[PDB]
């Protein structure tokens, strides 16, 4: 089956992937603390999309196709304490110093040091794959490692392989408050890579992921244990078509997902949404039907993004149903109303790539995942382009980017290369209007 | 299978969800009210007014049980019951319930609130129907001043109260004051084009000006108004 | 007279799970392939008992056959009559035709050639796919080329499934039709266009249960069988596959047929089955009706249908129909019979109807192509995988000709 | 035919812990609400597996449901099918009917209305409480008004628990009965009066263990179930809730029924179960016997009880019984069956008996009211909470009429 | 052939008809759980008297001419679980609420609601009939549905058609104990209909049907599975002349049966009896000859009625032999002794309508069925007339009859109309003495 590697860069990408392989292993009926399945019985679903057979005894551990890369040791040592013998600890690479909001440490620095060791483990995974057809890099677009080495690694991987999708499932900076002081820098330095050398960059935003766990999962303080579960359940939702060969499962590979969702090579920043956002308190009589999950998919406060999705133009949309469906013609006819309700872009007549997966989610029985390639995703990056310029008219922080090896000529290119990105939806908004 | 039955099923689930939420967390009363308003609307549309009343009474009991009393919430709930009574055709009860809303606000801080100005407008209208002109005028003026202080003079809500006073004065054949009111309403309504005001309100103002000018013996300006209303109502077909 | 079958794409192989579970029922075989009628048509007689079907289960994304050859049907198909390869013709014509198509097409043809050199009377190809995806429409477009280049004197019947007019179900799907409907128009002798909007509706009126693509395909799998059941359950008025080209295809372009089934052991008294067969809502495509006159309809009535009734029923139906001006008064409708109904039914009916309405399917798929191609709206996935805009606009100029060729046929 | 249930008061909700642990056993469900018979009667089918019951756990003093929804049964009940509010209807009718009743009655009705608009065949109300306290008898008197004012054509069965004749258990308790027995007489179509003196004695002879109000309620919870188990376990002689009003209630006042259970997996050979069912000591009330003739008895024999035996058993029992002079010789006793016994038993029996003896319960509760009302002996707790002496003497003049209406029925 | 509809009202009538169409289908060699016959071969006997050809394939189901009507859903859902695709489920009408011993729910109430739907299915059956010559309504005269709607339906059917016999094969209240508390009410309310608008009311009594399965079928507890088989074997005995066209079968239609058995329009309450009552344990050497079955027909404890038949006057008698007979002159000469033994009514010189059917019964080889129109059948209804008066001097139950729409003036008419019935045999007893 189409194998797929989940590379986990940075603290924000690892702590998603700490919770992502918790989910995926529990999704395949595999113990997430040992790597071994239930004794003697096969794992449910098609395990070999993400996993690898370690030991031919049918009860041994299944090592996930996952390299966890971060320049700070405390993140993966948290994972090594909370995974046991699940991961391959040759893939759980760590360093000492860290990056610390400095792009030019993850990209050209301590991340340059790990790059001969990281790529010597992707080559270990890919040669171990049957035929790998996607690489899901989990990082943030805010830090020094996830946005630094994530910009390095993806440009070190399509440059090497190139015939493989790189879905950079990434976490944008929240606009409510910046978790890094150099966070509108580090995005624009990664928007060089995540525009040019990544086939798609699935965004997530920490503001919207707070609101979708506070107002929707009805808790007071949504921790990062639950931000990395809203993301996870979406990342374990877009990859349910990759991992399951069921009844009428529309088996969507990453390339099969991105041919439907990347219209032209500079329009591949995808948002996401999940349904139902019913809390896990067993609201059984309030479980949502398919006619009303799609009504809750496309709310303005339902996507995992700072922008307002229905205030702009949905350019390419991919609604990935996942679970027990009784109603195929009631499916796709709710989207027929949503073809009328939602702002679409003629420039495209119709775009709803609809996945079914009969294997249900862990938390949900009838779960829906959206991937709307929106034009509003430039309006998230309009904030980042503006917060860059306020920190470039002053020529902000200091030498911190410049002493590591970057130049003022290069930084103005990458601002333009993010300006070329933001205009590339502004090209596609009014022409799509 | 009917469209209304579908709207009810959806609104009921949504209410039941907000009820359970307020079971787990008794503080979340405001959201229960909102969900209730939608379901109560639907029950009114089908004529089940006792069901609608029960929903609002339930909202009210939850609000009353809060350990920190929320007078603003109670004010709003009473005004929803008042409006329910009004649509039901129980005119005395509607006035009584708006008056209860106002009394709760007057006893706490809320004299100059959004809700209170709305209530005074709606109450004034019931007094017009009760044929108590002086009481209607009083409340309309109070609603008018409050909206003036809250929104600019240039706002939809100010123009609405102007309009309502206009119709009040017109109905008691005070033609002069009717004119002033409707012109002030016209002045505001022209300067406000977007989704902050629909054009059908602008047509009502011309319609109302038409009847006022005709009553004033200016049949020329009357027809000019009636014309511009017709142009507007026509132009919203596209 | 032994028809080879090809099941390319996830859409086609899911019909193959429906078709070879209905071909085994109508011939009365068990699911393993052994004996529980001309059984030679679909099935290659390997041994005295076991009948291996003449199907290639050609597929990318090899999880569809993992459903087939995992559960209950692994013993049936021969595994030298298959192909399973990752990656999966990534809903992308250029992957299915050029990138991951040229990897398998040497294996596809040499498995077809190992299945037709066991024949002893090869006549046709019931090649089953969709024109929507990248495997059924991409590699389906490639097999149609290589099979016509190998067998230019054999009838190649394509059993397509059109993209829905309702919504997409794939983003780049109006590209994948016109890149495929070119090669169907160039190679296949007659195509049956089916539509999942009509397959939803007619199955919704069939079952007291909301359908799925297993239940939708049983409408197709009967139509796939009923076309070629006057070829294997002979009866009277023996209609072979050579008579679905001479009778139903007037001009050299108009070979896209809209097939119904009726009744939708079920008995039907048959003055009303002909009214059910040629119901406008029972045809399995969203063809045009208020601006649509037929060219050439067919009627394959199988089972306990005696031929005296069509002098009263079908002559009444053809007066109710709308043909072109250049078709005669009571003529224009060919007929046929089989001496055996499908299992579960007692008298069935089929109607391959060549109609100007199928150009409205073509006009939809060009009006979607018109906006989507000029604005490069998914084009770079073809350009960066072999297929240029010159090769894709040329695909349009045949289908825009084909959408005109029915409007020239009124 | 789907019966809503209301469990008001601490007495009623403690039966709800007994009843919905016996309704889950007889329907064979686990305690969480999922499947481990007409299950639609008591249970609303939310999903394919989970069955949420049609119960409101309406209550003041919210510690009773904290026992229910704390330990083992929190997943069962829906929390939009409840009300919990402090203060606690302070064993005071005027708190339960007027003060803390009007706070919750808008929430009670809109939770009933959200539970009966999910129905699809609503027939009855098994409203379970006592006539003793202030929540079961005060708010129980208020729900009976508002439910009859909302559903005047549906049978409202009240499953009361009378104050004990033995001692009080509450000081103001003979006030709270007559204020409630008014509204039961005005609204409910038939009440089952149960008595904790008889529930102590019959449970004392049942168990080799001194009972508690969990063990007492399992006598009630079978009677609550056995009344409405010819409605959900059909069998022969299907007795619905509409036949407990037409058959057992002769005059428009005499609708207070005295129900027994037998046997008290337990098998019983059944010539002696009918002697156990209509034992005078097995009836669950301190009704009069030496000055008491029945009006209309019932006999719902569930489980492995075949109908041939009642021609020999029940005709023998009805000769042993004492009916009014205006009831026929072998008639006056309706019967019924269910095809499924309660879990734990193999052949059960029930006997709703409308009898002049239940007026001695009424005459006790008036003779207690006679001294206690004229001397203002707890009256100011009603007067200073809404309910005047005019409203309370008028409650007496109906029950003094009702205590006479059985003496007029001899 | 003369078609005949078996309408099945109430729980007591349905559970007979649940077992009646078990018998009749097995009697015609048709599977009682599918409706289809044995594959390819015709059903034995003349199927079209009770059945209908559904599907012209000669192996399809034969839908019986039977509408099952009851206001409680649990009775017909028991039949739908125990008939499969035999009945036409458009004829298996059910409701939710039920009647529950209340005549004025089946007659004027929930039975009034089903009456446009029930009569729209009798019209479906009768138009499907060749020429229907009888309607056998199976009910009880005790309940709220069978005695309520059975009184409604028969007055809604002779009022509509009128040229058709209505043999109300009905189950009287047992006098040993009443299964309904309002059971002597509900009979007298149905004795309006079953005297006036029914051409005959074949009675059955649950006391006698217990004794004829306890003492005769030698079991301890006769269940209602075996009450509805003593009745059934009698109802499949009086209809063997209707359904069989054999060797010398005296083909007795219902009208052909009631011209011999209804002397004048108020004397059409018929008892019944069956012979042999040999248990099904294969008592082969104790199988009864025709000289001694007739000795067991006319025992006091041999009729399906509470009354003692030989203690009163047999007014019209119809002994329906059914099975293999060797002895035609030994037949009818046993009845020549029974012309002398039995109390007959001059007022009639002779009355023994004698059916032969060569097609034997299922349970019996030489089976005999009696239909004695007795004068004692007023003595069953003398009990019901007396038990009504004890429950009318008090003015028993309550408003239950009166609130539904009935009046105290109407109820006194129907007591008189049952008094006119009881005296109508008291007219015919002493004048027949
Ligand atoms: N969703 C999610 N986001 C996180 C988490 N931890 C950090 N982030 C975000 O990730 C961004 C950058 O942190 P990171 O890349 O881990 O810094 P680095 O390790 O120095 O590269 C910050 O803006 C945080 O808001 C997490 O656990 N989940
Ligand atoms: N009739 C039918 N249509 C299907 C089935 N599965 C998918 N489709 C439709 O076929 C179209 C093409 O998908 P497909 O060709 O399977 O993708 P590919 O195999 O990756 O080329 C889609 O638009 C689906 O709506 C099926 O089992 N039956
Ligand atoms: N059968 C039964 N009786 C009870 C139970 N609990 C209390 N009682 C009796 O019910 C009577 C009324 O108390 P109650 O109505 O619970 O008080 P309230 O809930 O505050 O209105 C008392 O006299 C108790 O003797 C119980 O669980 N079962
Ligand atoms: N022979 C026979 N009689 C029955 C059966 N079930 C009930 N009965 C009798 O039928 C009478 C009335 O019951 P029924 O009409 O079914 O009540 P309803 O359904 O409420 O109208 C009772 O007196 C029972 O004795 C049965 O299965 N067979």
């Amino acid at each position: 089956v189409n194998n797929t590697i989940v590379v986990s860069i940075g603290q924000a990408g690892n702590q998603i992937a700490a919770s992502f392989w918790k989910t995926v292993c529990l999704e395949h009926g595999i113990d997430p603390l040992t790597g071994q399945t239930a004794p003697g019985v096969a794992p449910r679903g098609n395990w070999s999309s993400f996993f690898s057979k370690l030991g031919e005894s049918s009860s041994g551990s299944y090592v996930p196709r996952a390299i966890m890369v971060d320049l700070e040791p405390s993140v993966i040592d948290n994972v090594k304490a909370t995974s046991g013998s699940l991961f391959n600890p040759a893939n759980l690479i760590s360093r000492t110093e860290g990056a610390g909001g400095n792009f030019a440490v993850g990209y050209l620095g301590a991340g340059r040091e790990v790059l001969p060791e990281v790529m010597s483990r992707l080559d270990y995974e890919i040669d171990k794959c049957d035929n790998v057809g996607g690489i899901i890099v989990l990082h943030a677009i805010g830090g020094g490692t996830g946005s630094g080495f994530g910009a390095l690694l993806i440009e070190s991987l399509k440059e090497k392989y190139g015939e493989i999708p790189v879905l950079s499932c990434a976490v944008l900076p929240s606009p409510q408050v910046s978790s890094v002081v150099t966070e509108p820098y580090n995005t624009v330095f990664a928007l060089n890579t995540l525009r040019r050398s990544a086939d798609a960059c699935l965004i997530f935003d920490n503001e919207a992921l707070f609101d979708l766990a506070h107002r929707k999962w009805n808790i007071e303080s949504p921790t990062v244990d639950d931000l990395n579960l809203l993301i996870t359940e979406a990342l374990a939702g877009i990859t349910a078509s990759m991992r399951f060969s069921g009844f009428l499962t529309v088996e969507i590979t990453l390339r099969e997902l991105l041919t439907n969702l990347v219209p032209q090579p500079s329009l591949h920043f995808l948002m996401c949404a999940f349904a139902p956002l019913t809390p896990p308190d067993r609201s059984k009589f309030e479980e949502l039907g398919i006619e009303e999950m799609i009504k809750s998919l496309f709310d303005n406060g339902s996507v995992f993004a700072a922008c307002s999705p229905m205030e702009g133009r949905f350019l390419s949309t991919a609604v990935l149903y996942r679970g027990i469906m009784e109603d195929k013609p009631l499916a796709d006819a709710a989207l027929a109303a949503m073809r009328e309700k939602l702002p679409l872009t003629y420039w495209i007549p119709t775009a709803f790539k609809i996945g079914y997966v009969e294997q249900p989610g862990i938390s949900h029985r009838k779960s829906m995942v959206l991937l709307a390639n929106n034009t509003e995703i430039a309006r998230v990056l309009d904030r980042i382009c503006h917060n860059f310029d306020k920190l470039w008219q002053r020529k902000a922080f200091a030498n911190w980017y410049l002493n590591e090896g970057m130049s003022e000529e290069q930084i103005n290119v990458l601002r333009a290369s993010a300006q070329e990105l933001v205009q590339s939806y502004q090209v596609a908004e009014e022409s799509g209007a | 299978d009917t469209a209304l039955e579908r709207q009810i099923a959806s609104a009921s689930r949504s209410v039941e969800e907000a009820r359970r939420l307020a079971y787990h967390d008794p503080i979340r009363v405001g959201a229960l009210v909102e969900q209730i308003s939608v379901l109560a609307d639907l029950r009114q549309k089908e004529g089940d007014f006792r069901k609608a009343e029960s929903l609002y009474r339930e909202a009210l009991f939850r609000a009353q049980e809060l350990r920190k009393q929320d007078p603003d919430l109670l004010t709003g709930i009473y005004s929803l019951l008042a409006h329910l009574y009004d649509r039901w055709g129980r005119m005395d009860k509607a006035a009584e319930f708006y008056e209860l809303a106002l009394k709760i606000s007057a006893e706490n801080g809320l004299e100059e609130s959004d809700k209170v100005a709305t209530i005074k407008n709606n109450l004034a209208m019931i007094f017009k129907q009760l044929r108590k002109f002086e009481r209607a005028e009083g409340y309309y003026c109070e609603a008018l001043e409050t909206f003036q202080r809250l929104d600019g003079e240039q706002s939809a809500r100010v123009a609405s109260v102007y309009n309502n006073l206009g119709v009040l004065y017109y109905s008691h054949m005070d033609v002069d004051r009717a004119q002033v009111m409707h012109e002030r309403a016209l002045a505001i309504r022209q300067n406000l084009h977007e989704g902050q005001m629909d054009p059908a309100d602008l047509s009502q103002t011309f319609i109302n000006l038409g009847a006022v000018y005709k009553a004033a013996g200016d049949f020329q300006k009357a027809e000019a108004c009636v014309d511009r209303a017709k142009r507007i109502r026509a132009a919203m077909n596209g | 007279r032994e028809i080879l079958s090809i099941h390319v794409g996830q859409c086609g192989n899911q019909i193959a799970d429906s078709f070879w579970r209905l071909a085994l029922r109508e011939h009365g075989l068990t699911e393993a392939g052994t004996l529980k009628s001309n059984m030679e048509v679909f099935f290659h007689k390997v041994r005295d008992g076991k009948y291996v079907p003449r199907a290639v289960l050609v597929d990318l994304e090899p999880g569809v056959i993992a459903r087939i050859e995992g559960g209950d049907m692994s013993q049936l198909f021969d595994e030298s009559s298959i192909v399973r390869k990752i990656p999966g013709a990534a809903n992308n014509w250029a992957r299915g035709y050029n990138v991951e198509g040229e990897k398998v097409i040497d294996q596809i043809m040499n498995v077809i050639d190992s299945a037709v050199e066991k024949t002893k009377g090869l006549q046709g190809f019931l090649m089953t796919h969709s024109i929507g995806g990248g495997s059924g429409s991409g590699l389906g477009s490639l097999i149609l080329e290589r099979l016509r280049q190998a067998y230019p004197k054999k009838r190649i019947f394509t059993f397509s499934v059109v993209p829905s007019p309702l919504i997409s179900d794939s983003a780049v799907e109006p590209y994948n039709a016109i890149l495929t409907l070119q090669r169907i128009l160039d190679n296949a002798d007659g195509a049956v266009l089916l539509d999942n909007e009509a397959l939803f509706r007619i199955a919704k009126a069939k079952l007291n249960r909301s359908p799925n693509y297993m239940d939708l395909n049983n409408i197709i799998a009967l139509i796939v069988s009923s076309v070629t059941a006057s070829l294997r359950f002979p009866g009277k008025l023996n209609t072979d596959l050579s008579e679905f080209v001479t009778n139903l295809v007037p001009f050299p372009g108009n070979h896209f047929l809209t097939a119904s089934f009726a009744p939708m052991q079920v008995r039907t008294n048959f003055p009303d089955l002909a009214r059910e067969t040629f119901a406008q809502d029972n045809f399995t495509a969203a063809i045009d009706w208020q601006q649509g006159v037929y060219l050439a309809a067919s009627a394959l009535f199988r089972g306990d249908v005696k031929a005296k009734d069509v002098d009263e029923n079908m002559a009444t139906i053809r007066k109710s129909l709308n043909y072109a001006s250049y078709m005669p008064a009571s003529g224009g409708l060919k007929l046929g019979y089989a001496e055996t109904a499908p299992e579960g039914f007692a008298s069935s009916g089929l109607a391959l109807v060549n109609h100007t309405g199928i150009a409205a399917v073509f006009e939809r798929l060009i009006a979607q192509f018109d906006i989507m191609f000029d604005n490069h709206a998914y084009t770079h996935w073809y350009e960066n995988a072999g297929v240029s805009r010159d090769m894709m606009a040329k695909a349009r100029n045949q289908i825009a000709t084909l959408a005109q060729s029915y409007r020239d046929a009124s």
Side-chain angles (χ1 to χ4, degrees), chain C residues 78-223:
Chain C
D78 187 71
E79 199 155 1
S80 295
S81 69
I82 202 175
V83 64
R84 289 165 63 86
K85 191 178 268 73
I86 38 167
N91 285 123
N92 186 346
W93 194 81
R95 301 279 297 175
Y97 180 80
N98 207 167
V99 178
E100 291 293 325
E102 293 293 327
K103 289 183 186 178
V104 292
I105 195 66
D106 294 331
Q107 187 177 355
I108 291 163
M109 296 302 295
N110 290 319
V111 161
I112 289 166
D113 199 8
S114 69
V116 305
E117 287 293 327
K118 295 179 181 178
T119 312
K120 290 175 72 173
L122 181 71
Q123 182 183 2
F125 296 99
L126 300 185
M127 179 186 185
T128 299
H129 56 79
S130 176
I131 54 168
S135 179
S137 74
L139 187 57
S141 170
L142 180 62
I143 293 169
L144 284 164
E145 288 182 354
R146 300 294 180 85
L147 194 64
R148 177 62 65 190
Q149 287 173 2
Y151 300 100
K153 291 185 180 70
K154 285 168 192 188
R155 302 293 182 276
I156 306 175
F157 286 165
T158 290
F159 292 154
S160 292
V161 174
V162 178
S164 181
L166 192 272
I167 57 162
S168 69
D169 214 356
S170 173
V172 67
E173 193 164 0
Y175 282 114
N176 294 317
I178 307 304
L179 289 169
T180 300
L181 291 174
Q182 177 184 3
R183 278 83 158 88
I184 301 171
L185 182 61
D186 295 331
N187 300 114
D189 287 331
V192 175
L193 290 185
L194 302 170
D195 193 4
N196 289 321
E197 187 180 5
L199 285 160
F200 278 160
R201 181 191 62 198
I202 305 165
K204 188 69 163 296
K206 177 189 190 289
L207 298 175
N208 205 166
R209 177 258 187 86
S210 295
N212 50 6
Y213 293 163
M214 282 293 107
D215 291 330
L216 270 68
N217 293 324
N218 293 117
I219 299 101
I220 295 173
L222 292 171
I223 287 165

Side-chain angles (χ1 to χ4, degrees), chain C residues 239-251:
Chain C
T239 301
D240 59 349
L241 277 74
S242 298
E243 287 180 355
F244 295 112
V245 174
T246 304
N247 297 115
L248 295 172
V249 179
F251 294 154

